[PDB]
């Protein structure tokens, strides 16, 4: 995705860029009836706030030095054994 | 059920079967699709 690394624009409008194909006064008083209209008028985060805070003491070495992950359930092994054992079928003898 | 539907012909009038223009149907066999389908399952096929 180098053009995600480059990310220049050019002077060009996107549409032709590919050759693309499609296959104040009244608004003023309108705003008056808008702000007028509204004139008559989380918990989760709050929970974890303590712990996400208590991480304040965590050294960035431990951030650097941390395991990444593993597989405890052996998802691969059993998995590939399934999608192995089912590979083929057969015909039921006559 | 057949008779109470008016006998075979009155059914087949509901079909294309005249289209294949066999004179009378009395010699013919169908082809279960399940056979064709299965016979295509022993191959190697994406879930789609």
């Amino acid at each position: 995705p180098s053009f995600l690394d480059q990310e220049p624009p050019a002077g060009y409008v996107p549409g032709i860029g590919r050759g693309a194909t499609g296959f104040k006064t009244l608004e003023l008083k309108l705003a008056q009836k808008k702000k007028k209209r509204a004139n008559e008028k989380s918990n989760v985060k709050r929970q974890f706030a303590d712990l996400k805070e208590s991480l304040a003491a965590v050294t960035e070495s431990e951030w650097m030095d941390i395991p990444d992950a593993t597989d405890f359930t052996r998802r691969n092994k059993r998995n590939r054994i399934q999608e192995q054992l089912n590979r083929k079928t057969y015909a039921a003898p006559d | 059920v057949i008779q109470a539907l008016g006998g075979i012909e009155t059914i087949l009038e509901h079909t294309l079967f005249k289209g294949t223009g066999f004179n009378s149907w009395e010699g013919l066999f169908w082809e279960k699709a399940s056979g064709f389908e299965d016979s295509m399952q022993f191959k190697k096929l994406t879930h789609a």
Partner: protein
């Protein structure tokens, strides 16, 4: 692992003798076709499954054999007769002999 690519391939067709016997397994028998053919206009033969639910065997008996209920001997393919996996095979045979020497220890005593 990435799903390979959807695109179909030109079929390699190699049919030896050997390779054929290895095919006869996966390809429907003859009989197994004479099921599928449903005689038009006339109710199937069906049988009752384990569950009593009816398995149609449609033409598997030539209509002369329906009148007499002759079932079929016709052709029985020995090609697709199911056979053990490698591993399981030796667990079977192995356990058999082992049990047999245990037995013969009840043979002489």
């Amino acid at each position: 692992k990435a799903l390979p690519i959807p695109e179909d391939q030109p079929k390699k067709k190699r049919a030896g003798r050997k390779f054929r016997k290895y095919k006869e397994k996966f390809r429907l028998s003859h009989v197994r076709q004479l099921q599928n053919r449903m005689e038009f206009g006339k109710q199937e033969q069906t049988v009752l499954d384990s569950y009593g639910e009816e398995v149609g065997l449609g033409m598997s008996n030539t209509s002369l054999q329906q009148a007499v209920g002759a079932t079929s001997g016709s052709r029985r393919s020995a090609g697709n007769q199911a056979k053990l996996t490698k591993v399981m095979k030796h667990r079977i045979s192995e356990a058999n002999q082992q049990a047999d020497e245990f037995l013969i220890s009840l043979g002489h005593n």
